[PDB]
Amino acid sequence: GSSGSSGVTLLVKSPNQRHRDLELSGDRGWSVGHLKAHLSRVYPERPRPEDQRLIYSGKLLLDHQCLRDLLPKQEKRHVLHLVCNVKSGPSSG
């Protein structure tokens, strides 16, 4: 994986489950699995990299997959869909 320019802009959108978007870097060298974590950061909440559901145009992302392969090689910017998933909450109260 020989690459080194700057990175790609990933538009972290939400499927009407939070609203608002977030544009972060998505270097073709990055890793879905890694990105997640990286996201959890920029994301105000500190979610999990295993929970963070990375989707691209509906197509759910894995983790080991590279953005290079995922993202195209022509278009500009990208619109991702990071779905946050907790682990049950303390109902009532």
Side-chain angles (χ1 to χ4, degrees):
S2 226
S3 217
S5 172
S6 216
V8 306
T9 278
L10 304 182
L11 245 183
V12 163
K13 258 162 229 246
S14 30
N16 317 67
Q17 61 116 338
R18 262 221 322 162
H19 233 247
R20 310 237 227 62
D21 323 300
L22 192 90
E23 254 149 320
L24 84 142
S25 168
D27 181 33
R28 304 170 207 67
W30 271 14
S31 336
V32 173
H34 195 179
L35 166 48
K36 282 179 196 160
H38 177 116
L39 251 168
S40 144
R41 239 237 221 167
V42 301
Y43 241 34
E45 46 221 72
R46 311 254 297 180
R48 321 194 128 173
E50 247 243 46
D51 297 357
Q52 276 180 116
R53 251 208 201 158
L54 252 41
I55 286 129
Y56 159 87
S57 212
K59 265 132 89 275
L60 169 99
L61 312 188
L62 295 178
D63 35 274
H64 53 282
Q65 295 245 76
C66 233
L67 303 186
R68 219 270 228 281
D69 179 68
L70 298 201
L71 320 192
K73 300 173 245 73
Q74 239 290 329
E75 285 273 300
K76 278 222 171 145
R77 245 183 231 76
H78 327 263
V79 167
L80 277 268
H81 319 246
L82 170 63
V83 171
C84 195
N85 225 83
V86 313
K87 216 205 98 175
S88 244
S91 84
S92 311

